[PDB]
Amino acid sequence: MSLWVDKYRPKSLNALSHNEELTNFLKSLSDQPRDLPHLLLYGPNGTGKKTRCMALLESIFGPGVYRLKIDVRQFVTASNRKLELNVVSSPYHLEITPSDMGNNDRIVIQELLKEVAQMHRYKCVIINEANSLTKDAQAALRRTMEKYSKNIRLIMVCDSMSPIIAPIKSRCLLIRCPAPSDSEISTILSDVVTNERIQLETKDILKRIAQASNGNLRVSLLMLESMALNNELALKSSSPIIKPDWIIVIHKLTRKIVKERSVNSLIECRAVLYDLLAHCIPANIILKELTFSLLDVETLNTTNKSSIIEYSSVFDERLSLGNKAIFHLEGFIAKVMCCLD
Amino acid sequence: LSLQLPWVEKYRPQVLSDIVGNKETIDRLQQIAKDGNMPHMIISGMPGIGKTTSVHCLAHELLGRSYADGVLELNASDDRGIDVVRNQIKHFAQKKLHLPPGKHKIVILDEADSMTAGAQQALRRTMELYSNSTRFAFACNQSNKIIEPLQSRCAILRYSKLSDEDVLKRLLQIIKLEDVKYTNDGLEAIIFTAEGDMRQAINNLQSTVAGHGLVNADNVFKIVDSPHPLIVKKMLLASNLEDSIQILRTDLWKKGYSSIDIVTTSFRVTKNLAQVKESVRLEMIKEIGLTHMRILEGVGTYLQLASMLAKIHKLNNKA
Amino acid sequence: AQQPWVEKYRPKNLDEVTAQDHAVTVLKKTLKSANLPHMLFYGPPGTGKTSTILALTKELYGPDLMKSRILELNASDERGISIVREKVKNFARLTVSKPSKHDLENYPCPPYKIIILDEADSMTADAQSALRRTMETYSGVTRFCLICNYVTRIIDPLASRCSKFRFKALDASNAIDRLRFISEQENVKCDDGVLERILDISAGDLRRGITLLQSASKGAQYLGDGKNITSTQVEELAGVVPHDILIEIVEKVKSGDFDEIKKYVNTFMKSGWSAASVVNQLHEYYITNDNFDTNFKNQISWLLFTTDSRLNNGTNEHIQLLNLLVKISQL
Amino acid sequence: KRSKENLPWVEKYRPETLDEVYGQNEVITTVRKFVDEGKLPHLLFYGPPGTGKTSTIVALAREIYGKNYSNMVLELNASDDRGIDVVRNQIKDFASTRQIFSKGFKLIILDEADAMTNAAQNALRRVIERYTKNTRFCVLANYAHKLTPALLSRCTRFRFQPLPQEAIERRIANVLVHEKLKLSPNAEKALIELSNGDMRRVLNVLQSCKATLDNPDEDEISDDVIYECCGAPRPSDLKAVLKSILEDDWGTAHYTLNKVRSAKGLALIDLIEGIVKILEDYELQNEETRVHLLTKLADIEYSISKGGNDQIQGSAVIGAIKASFENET
Amino acid sequence: REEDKLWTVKYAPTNLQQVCGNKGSVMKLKNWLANWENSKKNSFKHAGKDGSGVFRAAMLYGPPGIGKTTAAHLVAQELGYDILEQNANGKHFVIIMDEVDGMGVGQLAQFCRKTSTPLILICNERNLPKMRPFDRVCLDIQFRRPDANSIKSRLMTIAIREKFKLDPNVIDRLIQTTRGDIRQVINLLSTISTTTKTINHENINEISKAWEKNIALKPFDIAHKMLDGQIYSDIGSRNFTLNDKIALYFDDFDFTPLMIQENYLSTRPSVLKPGQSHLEAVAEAANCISLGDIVEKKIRSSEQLWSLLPLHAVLSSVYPASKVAGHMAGRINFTAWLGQNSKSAKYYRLLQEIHYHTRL
DNA sequence: TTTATGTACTCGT
DNA sequence: ACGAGTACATA
DNA sequence: TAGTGTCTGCT
DNA sequence: GCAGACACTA
Ligand SMILES: Nc1ncnc2c1ncn2[C@@H]1O[C@H](COP(=O)(O)OP(=O)(O)OP(O)(O)=S)[C@@H](O)[C@H]1O
Ligand SMILES: Nc1ncnc2c1ncn2[C@@H]1O[C@H](COP(=O)(O)OP(=O)(O)OP(O)(O)=S)[C@@H](O)[C@H]1O
Ligand SMILES: Nc1ncnc2c1ncn2[C@@H]1O[C@H](COP(=O)(O)OP(=O)(O)OP(O)(O)=S)[C@@H](O)[C@H]1O
Ligand SMILES: Nc1ncnc2c1ncn2[C@@H]1O[C@H](COP(=O)(O)OP(=O)(O)OP(O)(O)=S)[C@@H](O)[C@H]1O
Ligand SMILES: Nc1ncnc2c1ncn2[C@@H]1O[C@H](COP(=O)(O)OP(=O)(O)O)[C@@H](O)[C@H]1O
Ligand SMILES: [Mg+2]
Ligand SMILES: [Mg+2]
Ligand SMILES: [Mg+2]
Ligand SMILES: [Mg+2]
């Protein structure tokens, strides 16, 4: 693929240079694939958890695992709300992600598991974004992977278990994929720019990219591609870091909040929130980085920052227990302006 | 064995004069029975106040001894639908029966509040077509579900709660006709336990007389308890927290009242509460509904109710 | 073997159920008799409720009879009010299958069938209300069993109609024998208290402890040096934070500077350690220590409880732990 | 199936005569004088779960009627469908037609009637009113808020009080006589505070205790057997935990609570209700202390119902109690 | 038959002089019907002064019992037409079908588009979603609550013919009590005159208290009523109680809480506490909207706890507007979340459309 | 949008 | 008569 | 052609 | 509340 993030992706444990202790543990588990428990890989985003799951599969299932395909099935729920979530099929392993509307994920998971329960011989299943499960598909898994413990193996790819209920953690193995420090991120970026052709004026550009990414390999590779295209394959230390329009408008919103604590300012903040939620960005990370932006302003005091993080936690639990994403964000911003004024 | 007929139909009124309550509606019905040209009416309100027996007595006075020939008793008990009810209304209205020169065929639709919009809009057409031959009648628990044009093309005679005088008069009539010993304490106990309802009052009186015999307040209390809204209102308006907690436990936890019913009654009482500032009522309702949710996931612990009352007193104390 | 340890050492018989004996003795003496009541198995996950009920099913009727005398329903299939009103009602309405001469000769074979609803707390209130008289109407021909790790979700009538058997959590003291037996049977080496530390890490769940022991064993045969398993390996495999990082976390907290605290919080979150473990470790450090004042201990206990309760309801671990550190820094 | 003794104590014993029902003495004598004299109205039986509603109505049907009442009395429950179609077909045909077995009136049992729809109740109230001459309706409901007020007003309301100590004592004496079993006074007291006014709970615990003993005969069940079989914390244990929380430091109390939980596998939640129950009779000079105690304990049990780490929740209980009592002065 | 007939049909308007109120719409319909043949000879190329020539069919709406059907019949019969009803110039058949909203709507709209005969539609709601096909295919003749003079004179005539005393200054209360429903006024006069032949100002207050023609408010009317500082004051709360506020919510309970959240920011509060700024009042008000977010999540979930609907009123509609209540600076704004949800859902659909296309 | 349970309705066989 | 597809209310 | 006064649609 | 339209008089 022309994209830079996915060309340079390891295809086995020996090709994995992200970490060594976790590679040792993965090949320790792969040494005896017979007694393999249900896995749960967790960590910050961009650590290659999907890649580690893949490389473990080829360590266990051998070659040919990356020969995936796309299959279409039909799903029936209450009334006649037809669902056609796609399963990413392949020989041996079958891959599917519960990226439904978040209301009827039970039927898809149950149907796929009961269909693959017909028959080395045990079929592993990985589902992504398992944190945002609706607490009911987890209830289905709680029995499905308990009874089908000799034919189906289930692997969790999620960034946290805080939404995950206790039984799922109980009947699964908790292994952690950490994010690397700046130095080995700079090393892997140097390896990449050695593989293809970029002339570097100074080696500090990769360190600055690693600092900007804050522990994310996919973000680092996308940033490297962006700088390579913008600078015509000639990296320069004077070139500033490229930030998303999302973070840019959040920064402008924070500056607007701190410069004017008025109701009208809250109106344009609500308009920006409308547009950003229309850009299909989950509101939890929006609130998280918004609060981190409020805590990264020099003129803020310590009591104001403490109140900001308190309201952050409160509206975070409110956002977790709710569906209207705009309500909690608007309330938190109103409380922030109230605290500042 | 075969029982005697219950006190419901043993004393259901047969003529319009027997019905007690609001004098204006009853004597209007009597005057229009004397006249004969009865207009279409929608009757609504709280149930058991004479919303159907008054219509039956009016129909009896209108149609004399030919009642069975030209009265179509309809209700939700038999069958309801659009193209069943409209078919039966069309069949009944198209019956050329020799009525008296100043009389019509009265049609009674008891409990038509739950009727569909299509059935009501077809009933409008049947009215505007056969108004010169038949005149309808609606008795419903809530007129809000009825479409607005139906109430537009009707003589609305909504009733209200029967006062203690009407209930006392009717109960004294039943007592004198059934040879029941009574006491003023028993009478007022029946009045409070009636909640302004005839059927509940006669049921409590019948239970008391066929049980303890003497109609006193204590025997009525043994056979039936005080309504929960009053006790819950006393709960949510008490001064101290320990008094509220002991009232809660002794009156609604040692008496077997379900916790979800307690919280629902608290919500209704606070929503229909007076003499309290509006914002105070709103915040009390907010926290009572939080406790309601807490009961709803499955946590029906008595301590949830205790915490609800504790937060009620915390908000009442104004920090 | 060919399949994991958790389903390999499941109690086949009633006597194999360790820790829980107050209900196992009841079931054992009900095996001889036939007056089996309705069972409500409630307790923490991994306490062996499913294993106990499967053992009871095997001992009551034997492998042949349970196929046609046991009905299994769970969240893997539909649990709506229609399914409750039709399938369960029909199954309880039919007569019992005739026991064979072989089954009656070997097994006691009580003349009733058992319908077990594992994860019964997930049923709707309407379904639970509908499934009330199916027990009493057909009690002479069948019995019901309910398994649910939240007993509070079960409504009052449904909980009353069944007998409550509380499956206590398998702590270090009660479940040491089972883990030890697994250790000598699988030839897993324990140095001084590795099994005890593993039981301490698990929140009363033997399945989690067996999983950590299996992972430690996997590492042991992968190294292949035949060396004694240390507590460091099993604590690193569990995912708990090393004590020195906890000490420097406390040092940063005692400083009170917000900027350094936030920077170190970001440094800690890019490591990826779970915030629940951090809350637990801060708890066992601050509560056990004596230098902190009583009011400070009460405040930090309340704050840790609030943080853990919020972490149970999803949310973001970064915000929760950063706010927790800020709160405990300003006490 | 295979003799009546092959049944649980809840179901082996079930009253078939009105004299075998204790506790609700007022209700039972009132309905007895309803049915013997011949003035039984439409009934509404309201009470807690497991307080003898359906047993009472079945015994009433057996007393009034003959043994063969299959076509005489129709029992309707949430186990089968109870939509408005059921009311308009089965109830309609049953109440409309005069009795075929005899020439008397009819009785229809609306068991757990609080689970039917509003339209079902709207049709059912008129079903009751039109055909009340030859048909009576008895309403069994645990929640009165799911019933329309018209259905409340039609039938006379019978409030089933929770069964007091006397009813439980006589019933356990009867089942001990029937099953040839002996009980210690502390064991039956523990049954009194554990049953929560339910025959089902006390009978199930008694059956579990009978199956607990190695020899059912010649052995007496004690309160320790009650506590170990039901997993109920001992009152002395609960008061010791509360005293350690209220008088010791944060290390001693935490160690004591962990040791108590680990020794007998006690549940933290049941410990919470034990402390709460021993806390109402504790005099508090500060009213806000009660507020903080109630709200903090309520949040802790809410978290327990949602689940989580047990030691953190136990220390949360300790901290809530200590901080609230710190308000004392 | 005689002397046994309802007042609403025995005292029926015989000509357009007898009909009272909404007279401009009466001339509009009369000129439409008189010039319908002129439009037919013109092949519907262009309209006239009133802009009704191009319209193939006319259509009426308004409150019930205002005289839409009566005026249509009288216009048809005075000009000379054959009245015919297909609802569920003298020799020219005119179609007078009532209750278009009582439903097929697409086929009826097409039949209105192509009709070789005069056609009149009578309904009560135009802005209904089912009436969207009738947006640009029928004339917009609009009736309303009529003036209290011609109906007053008609009631004088009816009363002096029926021999019962009344006062001149009763028409205003009669019209406003019945929301301008003339038929209900006739029914009220008949009903009262059956017993009380002295319907005057001394009794009209109990008459109104017994005969309020209560009607559900549209969302916009709900928002304006909910966002009023008078009804949350001590004096104004007694007239419009909390129960009425809860009852006001249930009229459009799907759309009520979205409207309150959209415009609780654009209103200047009038019940501000000492020290309560407009920004601080919003912060508490927005907190309750997030508090009401949990209730809406639980009600419309797998549990389906619809007994909690009154709770969603207080947390999401009443209390958020109870602290910022006052005169509004601008206009009622319709909620933009519904438009945002549709735009985001397609963007969410586009998010997973190409992503699965390029997955392999 | 929501999301099962229930009721309703008419079309079709 | 009964079953299936569609829509509405759920205070 | 332009002031009052009131009813109505903002989806 | 913000216009927009429909009268009455002028
Ligand atoms: N005003 C009254 N005077 C005498 N008996 C009355 C009166 N109102 C009701 N009853 C008695 O109530 C019973 C009939 O109740 P109904 O009038 O049919 O109830 P309802 O008022 O129509 O309410 P709903 O909505 O139909 S349940 C008979 O036993 C009557 O004797
Ligand atoms: N008392 C016990 N003795 C022996 N093994 C046990 C015991 N309790 C639990 N286990 C082990 O725990 C593992 C899982 O047991 P389960 O029966 O699934 O517990 P559980 O109560 O069903 O957990 P759930 O279903 O998630 S609530 C198996 O490997 C069992 O062998
Ligand atoms: N006074 C009593 N005397 C003897 N047994 C009783 C008494 N009250 C209740 N029981 C027993 O309680 C058991 C269960 O109660 P039931 O009457 O069957 O059900 P219920 O009390 O009506 O409550 P629900 O609706 O079934 S949850 C019965 O088997 C009876 O044996
Ligand atoms: N302007 C009026 N002047 C005199 N009487 C009227 C007037 N408007 C209505 N009425 C009376 O009220 C009755 C209502 O008749 P309709 O015109 O059918 O009512 P409507 O306005 O069409 O409302 P719908 O279609 O029935 S909901 C008439 O038959 C008259 O008796
Ligand atoms: N050791 C490594 N060498 C090269 N690329 C890596 C390595 N680890 C991760 N990556 C990159 O990470 C990308 C995938 O990351 P992903 O699995 O999405 O992380 P997460 O699962 O945390 O979101 C791949 O495109 C791959 O190029
Ligand atoms: Mg009635
Ligand atoms: Mg299980
Ligand atoms: Mg019962
Ligand atoms: Mg009309």
Residue numbers in the entry:
A (entry chain E): 1 to 119, 133 to 354
B (entry chain B): 5 to 323
C (entry chain D): 23 to 353
D (entry chain C): 7 to 335
E (entry chain A): 292 to 379, 415 to 429, 436 to 692
Provide excerpts from the study.
The eukaryotic clamp loader is Replication Factor C (RFC), composed of Rfc1-5, belonging to a large family of proteins involved in diverse cellular activities, referred to as the AAA+ (ATPases Associated with various cellular Activities) family. RFC uses ATP to assemble PCNA onto primed sites for replicative DNA polymerases δ and ε. The RFC pentamer forms a central chamber that binds 3′ ss/ds DNA junctions to load PCNA onto DNA during replication. We show here five structures that identify a second DNA binding site in RFC that binds a 5′ duplex.
3′-DNA1 is recognized by a series of α-helices in the RFC−3′-DNA1−5′-DNA2 structure. 5′-DNA2 binding does not markedly change the RFC structure. Surprisingly, we found that the two identical DNA molecules, when bound to RFC, resemble a single gapped DNA. Therefore, DNA1 and DNA2 are held by RFC like a gapped DNA with a gap size of about 7 bases.
